[PDB]
Amino acid sequence: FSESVPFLKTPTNLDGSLPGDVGFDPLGFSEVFDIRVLREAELKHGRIAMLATLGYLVQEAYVLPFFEKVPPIQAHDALVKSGGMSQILLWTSFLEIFGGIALFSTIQGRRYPGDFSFDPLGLSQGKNADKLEQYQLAEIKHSRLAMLAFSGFVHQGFITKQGVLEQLGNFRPIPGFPEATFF
Amino acid sequence: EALGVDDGRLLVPLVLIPVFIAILFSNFASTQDNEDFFDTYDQRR
Amino acid sequence: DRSYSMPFLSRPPALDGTMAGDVGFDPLGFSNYFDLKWLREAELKHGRICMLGCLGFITQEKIQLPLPGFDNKVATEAFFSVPAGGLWQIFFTLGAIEILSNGGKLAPADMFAEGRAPGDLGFDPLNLSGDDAALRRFELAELKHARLAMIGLGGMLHQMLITKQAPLEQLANFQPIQYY
Amino acid sequence: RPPGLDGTYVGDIGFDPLGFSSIIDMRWLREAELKHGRVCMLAATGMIVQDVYQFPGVTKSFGDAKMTTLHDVAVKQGSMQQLLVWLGFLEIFGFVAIVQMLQGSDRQPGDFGFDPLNCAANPDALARRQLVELKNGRLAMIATAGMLHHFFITGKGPIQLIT
Amino acid sequence: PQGFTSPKNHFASVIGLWVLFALPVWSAAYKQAGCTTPDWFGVSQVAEDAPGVGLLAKAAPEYNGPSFREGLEYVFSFVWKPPILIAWK
Amino acid sequence: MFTLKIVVYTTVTLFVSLFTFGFLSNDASRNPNRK
Ligand code: CLA
Ligand code: CLA
Ligand code: KC2
Ligand code: KC2
Ligand SMILES: CC1=C(C#C/C(C)=C/C=C/C(C)=C/C=C/C=C(C)/C=C/C=C(\C)C#CC2=C(C)C[C@@H](O)CC2(C)C)C(C)(C)C[C@H](O)C1
Ligand SMILES: CC1=CCCC(C)(C)[C@H]1/C=C/C(C)=C/C=C/C(C)=C/C=C/C=C(C)/C=C/C=C(C)/C=C/C1=C(C)CCCC1(C)C
């Protein structure tokens, strides 16, 4: 049976080859599509989610002196009409063209999924390769965690009209519900 | 305006009739040999 | 020998147990005078359109697009509230889909000239037809849902025409027909 | 004995006046029976308890409320939405388990692996407990139906009839 | 901002590029692994001998029978020549 | 007046479609020298 789900079987083409494989694939996504393409998608989603979570925290905590102090959703809305979001979209798309080229290289075997050889510092490149797999595991875990955490953040911001640090400091219930009186 | 179409119902004959005839024409078109011939006109019919 | 659907009428000559959904129900000799592949293709097309139509009847009552003119609870009135250009875009898109699926073979003389099976348009993103018994049971389920959706769409459309009320909306505050 | 009803399943006394087991897979039928029984056990226990405790803050939120009226108030509040979405999340993997069981695996109907207390160590104890679970679940189905229809006729809970 | 300089059009262009790239990337991923698993097959709780289940999937009878025009004439003969009165002979 | 307009539009569309699809049906092949 599967390690993560006791009452399910190991999802066929799902073993220790990819980092963080606890056998969790109840729906046969790894069988409808290639597992390496799905890992590339997962790494892209998780890295963007980690950056988004850190950005949410810092933007709620701090703002640059040349940017209006607004909630992050209001920041997206304000900079869409300001052109900064257009700049971010342009440069991200320019990088992601080569990212898609790398993904097409991944499809025909060759390079590892989500691997861009990006290593400005000497971390698991040389003299530390024995930790690399460990790092990989950590990475995807953080990825997955971020992919949840940011989500909760924004939806909590949608329901309480409070920042995540504001909700932590003042954990009042869902607005209008303490009064209750539904009958 | 447009094709003298001041009422939307006028678009029903202008589309359904050309399509229906086309469907009939399709039964002709599928029957014919649709390969190149390199001639002034196609004698295959 | 007997139909087993109407045990007083004998089995139709062209209705063998090969085709899915076959319980021997053909009191009028349509299968004797029309191609069974064409009949099955027409039945599946009508039923699939009706399944989508019933889902739309429920959803449009439940959810509407924020575009102007798209906010009508009653689907029959929603047809006339939506701009006609969009409906003609839908019609042309569906016609293109039909032509591409049949490959120009839109007549009963040529639609199954290459075979292609009745109702098999090649739409199967998930390989759920690998098992033969599973495929046969799925075909029976599809036919049953198709016929049920045809009847249900007819009922919902006529009741919407009468009451000017959406189906789930009409289920509450029933207000029998003589009230209108 | 009804056709298609072998003795390999626990709780079998050859009871099948209508040939449901002749047209529907017995694995699906037993999975549905166990799920209905467990849901009915939880439902009957909850309907009994809700006439006694009612929790700290539910009293000022829902007023008094009872049974179908409690469902009507709670769907408007939001507890029912949360329960529905979370049990649907669980039932997605339940659907996966049913599909894997029908496709052919070591899984058996009702075997979700939920044995945290290791009460299934003794095999004969588990064999007895399967029948115990089945019969208590069937009794729970009957009792939940009875409580629901008694509330329909009188508007009283399971304890308001007793007390 | 309007047209090719509007940020909404930039977002729409990015979405369109995603849609255009969806077919090659995910089609190739499907070609590598396309539910071609021995355990991958549909399941139905209904018994395979239930009434209405066909003997063979996707049946294509030959139909060496009457033409379409004869069928239409038969359907018209339903309404101008039904077998109602031939019983009283 | 609308019913007359829709009848005229139906008739004109039918005849124009017949003309158009008839001259699309390989009209050049309909000559006595075609083999
Ligand atoms: C390196 C190339 C480059 C260049 C030339 C620009 C140019 C511009 N960006 Mg930036 N941008 C870039 C890359 C670049 N972008 C990248 C990679 C990102 C992350 C995805 C962004 C994210 C970004 C945001 C979020 C915003 C801009 C904005 C702007 C515009 C306003 C300029 C400004 O603030 O006043 C002049 C600039 C200053 C006063 C800041 C000091 C700059 C110093 C003096 C120059 C240092 C060298 C410079 C960075 C050039 C680097 C390359 C060089 C070393 C070869 C301007 C057209 C803003 C906009 O749209 O306008 C409203 C805006 O909000 N950009
Ligand atoms: C450009 C548009 C276009 C084109 C070219 C096609 C092309 C085609 N469609 Mg159509 N279709 C389209 C758009 C289009 N579709 C759209 C937008 C819809 C709605 C979603 C449909 C719905 C549809 C259905 C439901 C069916 C087709 C069928 C067909 C095929 C046969 C066409 C034929 O001979 O009918 C020529 C036209 C007719 C024969 C007239 C229709 C017959 C009337 C309506 C029957 C009335 C029965 C009556 C009410 C019941 C008696 C009641 C009793 C009391 C007496 C062909 C491939 C049929 C098919 O594949 O058959 C195997 C089929 O069954 N299509
Ligand atoms: C799935 C079927 C379908 C397809 C395949 C399809 C493709 C395209 C393409 C080709 C890629 C373009 C370029 C395009 C453009 C527009 N479509 Mg669209 N379209 C489809 C369906 C609908 C519906 C149902 C509506 C609609 C609309 C508009 C308007 C608004 C006009 C305006 O601004 O008023 C514009 C510009 C609305 C409408 O025309 O209202 C008057 C409306 O109801 N469309 N559409
Ligand atoms: C985990 C056990 C537990 C469960 C399962 C549970 C379920 C529900 C439901 C579910 C249907 C509703 C709707 C509901 C509503 C309220 N709860 Mg309650 N609740 C639980 C525990 C506590 C505690 C420990 C407290 C508390 C309170 C309130 C208040 C406060 C304002 C008010 O009184 O107006 C309201 C509205 C606080 C309090 O002030 O209680 C008098 C407080 O300390 N609850 N509670
Ligand atoms: C094939 C394909 C796939 C697929 C797929 C899809 C798209 C499946 C979708 C299936 C759907 C939407 C089926 C819908 C059926 C709707 C019905 C039967 C409605 C009945 C209404 C009734 C009975 C009624 C009524 C009413 C009446 C009349 C009047 C009212 O007073 C009362 C009432 C409301 C009761 C996928 C991608 C998954 C995978 C694959 O590789 C290939
Ligand atoms: C007006 C309008 C609205 C919006 C604009 C629009 C699109 C232009 C237009 C729509 C027009 C449209 C799309 C109109 C569509 C109208 C439809 C779909 C009418 C279908 C009616 C179905 C019937 C009568 C089936 C009844 C089943 C029976 C009797 C079953 C019998 C059974 C059998 C044989 C088996 C044995 C058991 C029993 C139960 C006995």
What report would you give on this structure?
With 45 residues, chain B is mainly α. Chain B has one helix and no strands. Chain B has one helix spanning 11-31. The longest helix of chain D has 32 residues, at 123-154. The relative contact order of chain D is 0.15. Chain F is an all-alpha fold. Chain F starts with a helix and ends in a 12-residue tail after the last helix. The chains are: A mainly alpha (183), B mainly alpha (45), C mainly alpha (180), D mainly alpha (163), E mainly alpha (89), F mainly alpha (35). Chains in contact: A-D, A-E, B-C, B-F, C-E, D-E. Chain C binds chain E through residues 4, 14, 16-23, 28-30, 32-37, 108-109, 112, 115, 117-118, 120, 126-141, 143-144, and chain E through 34-36, 40-44, 46, 48, 50-61, 63, 65-66, 68, 70-71, 74-75, 78. The site of one chlorophyll A has 6 residues of chain A, from helix 4. It is classed as photosynthesis. Keywords: Photosystem II associated with CAC antenna from Rhodomonas Salina, photosynthesis. Structure of inactive Photosystem II associated with CAC antenna from Rhodomonas Salina.
Give a concise summary.
The PDB classes it as photosynthesis. This is part of a larger assembly, with chains A (183 residues), B (45 residues), C (180 residues), D (163 residues), E (89 residues) and F (35 residues). Chain C has 180 residues and is mostly helical.
What key attributes describe this structure?
part of a larger assembly; 6 chains; B: 45 residues; mainly alpha; C: 180 residues; 6 helices; globular; binds chlorophyll A; binds Chlorophyll c2; binds ligand II0; binds the ligand CC1=CCCC(C)(C)[C@H]1/C=C/C(C)=C/C=C/C(C)=C/C=C/C=C(C)/C=C/C=C(C)/C=C/C1=C(C)CCCC1(C)C; PSII_PsbI (chain F); membrane (chain F); photosynthesis (chain F)
Radius of gyration of chain B: 17 Å
Count up the helices of chain C: 6
H/E element sequence of chain C: HHHHHH
Number of contiguous helices of chain B: 1
Structural class by sheet pairing and helices of chain C? mainly alpha
Q: Find the count of extended strands of chain B (DSSP E, 2+ residues).
A: 0
Estimated share of beta-strand residues of chain B: under 5%
Number of strands of chain C: 0
Ligand names: chlorophyll A, Chlorophyll c2, the ligand CC1=C(C#C/C(C)=C/C=C/C(C)=C/C=C/C=C(C)/C=C/C=C(\C)C#CC2=C(C)C[C@@H](O)CC2(C)C)C(C)(C)C[C@H](O)C1, the ligand CC1=CCCC(C)(C)[C@H]1/C=C/C(C)=C/C=C/C(C)=C/C=C/C=C(C)/C=C/C=C(C)/C=C/C1=C(C)CCCC1(C)C
From the helix content, strand content and strand pairing of chain B, which structural class follows? Answer: mainly alpha
The major beta sheet of chain B can be summarized as: none
State the distance separating the first and last CA atoms of chain C: 50 Å
Query: What is the chain-wise order of helices and strands of chain B?
Result: H
Sheet having the most strands of chain C: none
Strand content of chain C: under 5%
Judging from the principal axes of the Cα atoms, what is the shape of chain C?
A: globular
Helix coverage percent of residues of chain B?
Answer: 40-55%
Question: Helical proportion of chain C?
Answer: 40-55%
Assembly of the depicted chains: part of a larger assembly
